Design a protein around this ligand. Structure first.
Ligand SMILES: *[C@@H]1O[C@H](CO)[C@@H](O[C@@H]2O[C@H](CO)[C@@H](O)[C@H](O)[C@H]2NC(C)=O)[C@H](O)[C@H]1NC(C)=O
Ligand SMILES: *[C@@H]1O[C@H](CO)[C@@H](O[C@@H]2O[C@H](CO)[C@@H](O)[C@H](O)[C@H]2NC(C)=O)[C@H](O)[C@H]1NC(C)=O
Ligand SMILES: CC(=O)N[C@@H]1[C@@H](O)[C@H](O)[C@@H](CO)O[C@H]1O
Ligand SMILES: CC(=O)N[C@@H]1[C@@H](O)[C@H](O)[C@@H](CO)O[C@H]1O
Ligand SMILES: *[C@@H]1O[C@H](CO)[C@@H](O)[C@H](O)[C@H]1NC(C)=O
Ligand SMILES: *[C@@H]1O[C@H](CO)[C@@H](O)[C@H](O)[C@H]1NC(C)=O
Ligand SMILES: *[C@@H]1O[C@H](CO)[C@@H](O)[C@H](O)[C@H]1NC(C)=O
Lengths: 655, 220, 213
């Protein structure tokens, strides 16, 4: 049978190579069982006439496919659109010998379209593999607004969220822009120092100029770009040591033609033995129909593999991506590029010389340039953090103890000293006690400097979703860590699942539970006087706290929680006084806070014992590089007996 | 005990002559991590060749076949997936002379055990040309006595239907070098296994471990 | 805010009647009170036809499909379930003359909206044979001024994505006459409904109960 295929090129010389390839592939099977022809057209400066010419090419024969290539024109985006749309009307399968834009993969918009070269989006897999190899976890992603940048970012975020790690910071600048120092300035003020670039050549050059002006291209940094950003005028001026990557043998335009014709022949041979010989559309006018077996031909073509291609084994992705093309790692060794390793998209094999980095050093850089000035946020809790006013001399009055050594103190700022009515006022105070001493030991153990301060609301911190919105932002101290106000939390913070979702803790240093305080029938949470509302006994807690979540996390206790929704304190030891004034019947709260005051002052008793047990722990931002050392210090403190000596000092000196 | 959630049961014409395309379509449309198939040797070869064509022989799936298939047991042909599992009976590796010796031992033990009750081997009845004989109680008693027999560890107890009951079956599987090998014994209703996990192979023959799997240690 | 506890999601492959066996098994073993399906009009005739064979069209169950299907709203086809719910933008009953009137009205409204600014009436591009129009001149205002313009008390705010944002849209269903009927509007983001209780018109499910204080 006479089987006909088509093609479109621009060489007028490699078209001879196309006809030679189709004849040589006809030498593989030529018993007339199927017989192959070949047609061709050239490109034109006008697009509408180009579409009409592809129309007339299509009518010329009973064509089974189309092969389109990139002409000497510099507008590489729209060049294969007039052939794809027109033929896309009749579901005629097409192939792309060389095109990299990531819009042709949207199968809902270009109905029938394939490829033999991976798009610009697939580089994210190579970047992820390199990150896994070199172990750089804190990354910064700088991208553009054009569809290609969004697609690349979406793929990289898909991988990172598949490992549930996320990105340190994502920031994008609109395309065709200049004098954009603001965004690099915004990205400069973080601990993560590896930045990943993807933009056009001119934008790459502009970013290079700005970054070189901002000193951010020297030592301590590593930033690796794609392939579109080390070509042309962008390659002219760039900092030394920029990692990159190039295709296996792309832009040959004649190596892929043999593979295209081979796979087309392999597909058409398998297609022709099917019952439905619809026979491709004939005519560009009047025929307002589709090809009756176009989808079937595309499906068989997709799942047809090749044995020995000049560019390697050929398979197709779910949309026609090249599926395991090679990749070559690059570098900038003093104004001249070089090959450093070959990665096949699954793994990277360094098969070349050593790689130099921007600072000229030879040892591998690590990200997260660790700061030394850390903010700290805490709350007013009696047994742990005492707040006091300072004197006029500038130092809070000294206070010796029976041991023979003084009590450590520090200066804590932040509040108005009057929560209910305060227009605007921040005052300096003094803080001391248990957690402050623990912070003293921690800081002296791991070489750092602290600047303590207090929260702006007074509540511990609890997730909530305000009305007229779909996003929920944490409130109070817990929010302060996420939004960037603080860096660490040295305070009695309990460890619940909801907190553990977005922050990460150290090992616990004090275990406890929840219990009840009563002024000297009251018992645990089983009595009908408690399960049901009655005026004889009234229970309450502190609003916007953990116990609120614990009592809203249980359907079968709804009514009881509702009771708590009626009235509760946004308070402190003030609640202990409200119990003292016979206003409140009983109190339910953490074990240590109640047990200290009960045995400390007078006339108050703890009811029964604990029922729900939990610990106390330091809070730190997600995957911060300090947690391991903090936990190793806490365990060492537990093993020494220092938390024992510290414990008697502050809690066992009572009764 | 367990529910044994069944997925799909398919009967396909796997003879010498037939439409290959229909069975190709039927086999290409399936998804189940365990397959159990019952065919004959030629049908087994055809089925396995077709399955290898339609991507069902890689390291993901598992096959099980009765002893009716597997042929010779000393010449595994091509297109047989590595890891094919079967259950053969005891003495799947003995010699022909040894098996004849076992048969003569069974006959001799039956006759001897008959003597310890009545004391004589019954006379023959071989009138092939004359073809006589209504029900005969003497040979009936001899046969009734011939059912049960033991021999130094191997017990050959025959059911009323002329197949032995309670044998010691042995599981076999195709090793990574196309050579049958024992995997698990079976004696008195309890199964054993050579491996605590099912070793799973690949096309290049380097064995892989599933991602959702791990080994846990502990003690008392 | 509601819990929204979902049972299963299934991806079928249904077309011409050659490969129509695996989807049958997949559709056989899924059960639910409510179904939300996504397919084209040339494929609902296969989906519902196979569903009517595996007991999924009785009054116990109820269906909801977007506006991509049911393309010929004038004459609904057979084998469709009685009483499936879809959503259609406003002016689904309008006449073709009314539609062209609305189009010319919105265009002229934008043009005269710029005219009140007394700037110009910009001329189009030249032709197709020159491949002209390299950059966007001060003409870019025109397109922008073609967005907010309303008409006859109908919000026609067009998004930067080329589709209108926050219109009024209605809900339709198939009564026991096989012709669509309005159910409830969506004016200003509050649902109206013509039926306080779903009719369930026409083994079974969905049994009614009674109780008193
Ligand atoms: C096989 O291909 C050749 C060329 O690829 C076709 O011949 C062309 O036919 C068109 C008809 O409009 C002419 O304009 C070209 O000048 C022809 N080119 C050559 C090189 O002859 C031929 O028609 C194809 N075979 C069939 C059966 O159509
Ligand atoms: C409709 O939206 C446009 C913005 O796209 C509004 O603003 C006009 O924007 C252009 C920008 O080229 C200005 O030069 C005009 O001066 C802006 N408004 C006018 C009319 O002067 C426009 O105001 C919006 N109209 C409505 C209905 O509010
Ligand atoms: C190290 C190695 O063999 N990997 C790739 C190989 O897969 C590929 O075929 C070849 C070019 O085709 O480039 C190299
Ligand atoms: C200036 C600075 O922070 N560098 C510190 C130094 O002060 C500290 O004494 C040392 C350990 O003793 O670790 C390093
Ligand atoms: C293209 O590929 C061929 C085959 O590998 C090779 O000989 C040739 O040098 C490559 N480049 C060009 C420009 O042809
Ligand atoms: C953690 O502690 C080790 C020694 O215990 C030290 O070498 C390392 O630099 C510390 N890391 C950080 C981030 O402080
Ligand atoms: C079964 O075994 C017993 C034990 O030796 C033997 O006495 C008997 O003859 C055998 N056969 C029958 C039918 O019991």
């Amino acid at each position: 049978k006479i089987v006909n295929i088509g093609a479109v090129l621009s060489t007028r010389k490699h078209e001879q190579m196309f006809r030679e390839a189709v004849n040589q592939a006809n030498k593989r099977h030529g018993s007339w069982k199927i017989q192959l022809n070949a047609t061709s057209v050239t490109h034109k400066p006008n697009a509408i006439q180009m579409a009409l010419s592809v129309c007339e090419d299509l009518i010329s024969s009973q064509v089974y496919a189309i092969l389109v290539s990139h002409p000497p024109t510099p507008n590489d985006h729209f060049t294969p659109t007039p052939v794809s749309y027109t033929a896309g009307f009749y579901r005629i399968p097409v192939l792309g010998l060389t095109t990299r834009m990531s819009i042709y993969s949207d199968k809902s918009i270009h109905l029938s379209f394939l490829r033999t070269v991976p798009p610009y989006s697939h580089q994210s897999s190579v970047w992820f593999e390199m990150m896994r190899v070199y172990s750089w976890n804190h990354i910064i992603l700088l991208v553009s607004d054009d569809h290609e940048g969004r697609a690349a970012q979406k793929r990289l975020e898909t991988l990172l969220e598949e490992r549930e790690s996320k990105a340190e910071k994502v920031l994008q600048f609109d395309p065709g822009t200049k004098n954009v120092t603001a965004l690099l300035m915004e990205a400069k003020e973080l601990e993560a120092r590896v930045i990943i670039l993807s933009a056009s050549e001119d934008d790459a050059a502009t970013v290079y100029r700005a970054a070189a002006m901002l000193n951010m291209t020297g030592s301590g940094y590593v930033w690796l770009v794609g392939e579109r950003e080390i070509s042309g005028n962008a390659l002219r001026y760039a900092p030394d040591g920029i990692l990159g990557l190039q295709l296996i043998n792309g832009k040959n335009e004649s190596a892929h033609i043999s593979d295209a014709v081979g796979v087309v022949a392999q597909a058409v041979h398998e297609l022709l033995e099917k019952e439905n010989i619809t026979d491709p559309p004939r005519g560009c006018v009047g025929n307002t129909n589709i090809w009756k077996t176009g989808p079937l031909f595309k499906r068989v073509l997709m799942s047809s593999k090749y044995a020995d291609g000049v560019t390697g084994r050929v398979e197709f992705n779910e949309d026609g991506d090249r599926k395991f093309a090679n990749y070559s790692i690059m570098n900038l060794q003093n104004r001249k590029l070089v090959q450093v390793g070959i990665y096949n998209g699954t793994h990277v094999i360094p098969n070349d010389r050593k790689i130099i980095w921007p600072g000229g050093e030879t040892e591998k850089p690590r990200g997260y340039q660790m700061s030394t000035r850390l903010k700290i946020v805490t709350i007013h809790q009696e047994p742990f953090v005492y707040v006091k006013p300072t004197l006029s001399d500038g130092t809070c009055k000294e206070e010796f103890t029976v041991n023979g050594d003084p009590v450590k103190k520090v200066i804590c700022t932040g509040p108005n000293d009057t929560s209910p009515g305060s227009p605007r006022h921040t005052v300096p105070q003094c803080c001391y006690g248990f957690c402050i001493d623990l912070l003293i030991k921690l800081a002296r153990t791991m070489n750092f400097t602290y600047e303590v301060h207090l929260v702006a609301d007074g509540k511990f911190g609890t997730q909530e979703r305000v009305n007229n919105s779909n996003k929920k932002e944490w409130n109070g101290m817990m929010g302060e860590l996420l939004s960037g106000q603080a860096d660490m939390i040295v305070a009695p913070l309990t460890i619940n699942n909801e907190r553990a979702q977005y922050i990460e803790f150290s090992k616990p240093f004090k275990y406890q539970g929840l219990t009840i305080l009563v002024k000297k029938r009251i018992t645990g949470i089983n009595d009908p006087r408690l399960r049901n509302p009655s005026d004889k006994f009234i229970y309450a807690t502190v609003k916007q706290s953990s116990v609120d979540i614990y009592f809203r996390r249980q359907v079968e206790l709804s009514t009881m929680y509702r009771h708590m929704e009626k009235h509760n304190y946004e308070s402190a030891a003030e609640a202990i006084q409200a119990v003292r004034d016979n206003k409140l019947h009983a109190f339910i709260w953490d074990s240590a806070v109640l047990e200290f005051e009960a045995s400390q002052k007078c006339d108050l008793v703890t009811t029964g014992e604990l029922f729900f047990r939990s610990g106390f722990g330091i809070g730190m931002r997600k995957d911060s590089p300090w947690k391991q050392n903090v936990s190793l210090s806490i365990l060492k403190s537990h093993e020494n007996g220092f938390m024992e000596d510290l414990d008697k000092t502050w809690v066992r000196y009572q009764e | 005990h367990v529910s044994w959630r069944l997925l799909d049961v398919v009967t396909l014409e796997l003879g010498p002559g037939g439409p290959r395309a229909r069975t190709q379509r039927l086999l290409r449309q399936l998804d189940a991590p365990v397959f159990v198939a019952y065919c004959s040797r030629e049908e087994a070869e055809v089925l396995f060749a077709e399955a290898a064509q339609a991507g069902l022989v890689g390291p993901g799936h598992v096959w099980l076949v009765p002893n009716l298939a597997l042929g010779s047991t000393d010449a595994p042909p091509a297109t047989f997936p590595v890891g094919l599992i079967s259950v053969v009976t005891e003495s799947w590796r003995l010699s022909l002379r040894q098996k004849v010796r076992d048969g003569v031992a069974i006959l001799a033990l039956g006759a001897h055990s008959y003597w310890r009750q009545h004391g004589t081997l019954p006379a023959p009845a071989g009138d092939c040309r004359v073809h006589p004989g209504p029900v005969s109680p003497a040979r009936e008693a001899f046969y009734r006595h011939l059912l049960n027999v033991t021999w130094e560890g191997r017990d050959f107890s025959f059911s009323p239907g002329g197949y032995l009951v309670q044998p010691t079956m042995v599981v076999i599987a195709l090793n990574r070098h196309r050579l049958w090998e024992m995997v698990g014994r079976w004696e008195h209703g309890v199964l054993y296994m050579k491996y605590p996990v099912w070793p799973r192979y690949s096309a290049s023959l380097q064995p892989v471990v599933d991602s959702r799997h791990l080994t846990v240690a502990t003690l008392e």
